[PDB]
């Protein structure tokens, strides 16, 4: 040390002989295949050695050597940014791209691998790889539905192109993949479906026109159907994508609802997996922040008893989302609709939230209780009686205590709200 890579490896790598070049390359490749810690730093630190591999990519008469070399560079291009920058600076990218078109399958595959690593390193590496025109010849690769490892690599690499919100890729540079992507949803392989959902979630993760674009490739129905997939690998990203699409306006969200998503979301509300329940709650909250009919479609899917049961039984991350789901409904609902929520028993679970640390949740819960008190006030005048039906009910859930306790809470808006509510609705 140094010399934990052969003196002879340098000698062979740099020789005239193709056999020795390959032999050394193989040693490199196996050492970089090492699970615990591969010698990335040592390799990068012998100064013409990367460049040599990059030149070996150019050897169109040699399948093996091209392949092993792409493998070596694939691994250096794994893990960190500083080791990846060396591969970029030796100009490996245009070469790998040109290698997307090689007559060799193995080379084609490994090259898409390495490019996936490089694009997945950072934002500027991502755009740098788009700028070198990876898309056309990458997309071209799906046109042979025969080979699986290649298709996995490609969607995988592709989701790296779409990934990253800071800044997002230039949409126009990335939105050409929507076709391939929509129809890869009908394929059978778990990994392929998973990455195509990742990719579709990254692309739906933005403003309404980007969502529109995802909607127009018609993936919604597949995406909603994949919520029922047996493998979590597929369900999470699909859940994200559907989750992202429903951040749009009411029309865009309607498209998801027209695919009968709610019935699947309800199912997901019982997932063993907490992140799934959490994500399904959040998706629901964005549906119950829509118009009266959407709220009502959530009522009729029987979603609300599961949300309430979630508020009572689940992790605080999860319950936050259920809580938003319920208060949004009280905010956009008809009187009959809020009566339904009260009759279900949403009052106590809101009142229990009032004493948690997260101030927003407290606000959320107060917002919903306000909304309910407001409808009840509106009722005391339609009917004869001048008593608010929800006053006694909020008191009975120890909600009244919590709200007074909240007058001495440190937060300004909290104490104020609690004060105005006591004054407006309690005696």
């Amino acid at each position: 040390p140094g010399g934990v890579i052969t003196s002879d490896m340098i000698e062979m790598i740099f020789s005239k002989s193709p056999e020795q070049q390959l032999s050394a390359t193989q040693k490199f490749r196996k050492l970089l295949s090492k699970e615990p810690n591969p010698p990335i730093d040592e390799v990068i630190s012998t100064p013409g050695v990367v460049a040599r591999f990059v030149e070996f990519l150019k050897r169109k008469e040699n399948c093996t050597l091209q392949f092993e070399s792409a493998w070596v560079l694939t691994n250096i291009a794994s893990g960190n940014s500083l080791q990846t920058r060396i591969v970029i600076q030796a100009g490996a990218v245009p070469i790998f791209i040109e290698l997307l078109s090689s007559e060799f399958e193995d080379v084609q595959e490994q090259a898409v691998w390495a490019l996936g690593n490089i694009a997945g390193d950072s934002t500027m590496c991502r755009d740098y790889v788009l700028d070198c025109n990876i898309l056309p010849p990458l997309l071209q690769l799906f046109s042979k539905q025969n080979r699986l490892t290649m298709t996995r690599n490609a969607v995988w690499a592709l989701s790296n192109l779409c990934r990253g919100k800071s800044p997002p890729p230039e949409f126009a540079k990335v939105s050409p993949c929507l076709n391939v992507l929509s129809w890869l949803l009908f394929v059978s392989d778990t990994d392929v479906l998973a990455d195509a959902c990742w990719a579709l979630s990254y692309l739906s993760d933005g403003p309404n026109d980007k969502i529109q674009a995802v909607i127009d490739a018609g993936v919604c129905r597949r995406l909603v159907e994949l919520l029922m997939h047996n493998d979590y690998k597929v369900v999470s990203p699909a859940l994200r994508a559907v989750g992202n699409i429903v951040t749009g306006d009411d029309i865009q969200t309607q498209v998801i609802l027209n695919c009968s998503a709610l019935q699947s979301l309800l199912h997901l509300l019982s997932s063993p997996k907490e992140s799934i329940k959490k994500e399904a709650c959040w998706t629901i909250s964005n549906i119950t922040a829509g118009n009266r009919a959407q709220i009502q479609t959530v009522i009729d899917a029987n979603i609300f008893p599961a949300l309430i049961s979630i508020l009572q039984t689940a992790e605080f991350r999860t319950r936050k989302e259920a809580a938003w789901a319920i208060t949004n409904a009280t905010s956009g609902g008809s009187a009959e609709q809020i009566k339904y929520l009260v009759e279900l028993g949403c009052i106590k679970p809101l009142c229990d939230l009032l004493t948690v640390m997260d101030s927003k949740i407290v606000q959320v819960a107060l917002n919903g209780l306000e909304n309910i008190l407001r409808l009840g006030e509106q009722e005391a005048k339609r009917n004869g009686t001048g008593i608010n039906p929800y006053c006694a009910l909020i008191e009975e859930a120890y909600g009244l205590d919590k709200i007074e306790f909240l007058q001495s809470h440190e937060n300004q808006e909290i104490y104020q709200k609690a004060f105005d509510l006591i004054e407006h609705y309690f005696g």
Binding site: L32, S33, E35, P38, W71, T74, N75, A77, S78, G79, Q110, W113, G116, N117, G120, D121, W156, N160, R163, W198, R240, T247, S275, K278, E279, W282, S285, N286, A289, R317, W324, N328
Partner: peptide, 16 residues
């Protein structure tokens, strides 16, 4: 409204 929410590790080494 919009938003845990984390992702797969972006890089993958070829092993074995």
């Amino acid at each position: 409204r919009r938003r845990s929410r984390s992702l797969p590790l972006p890089k993958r080494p070829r092993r074995a």
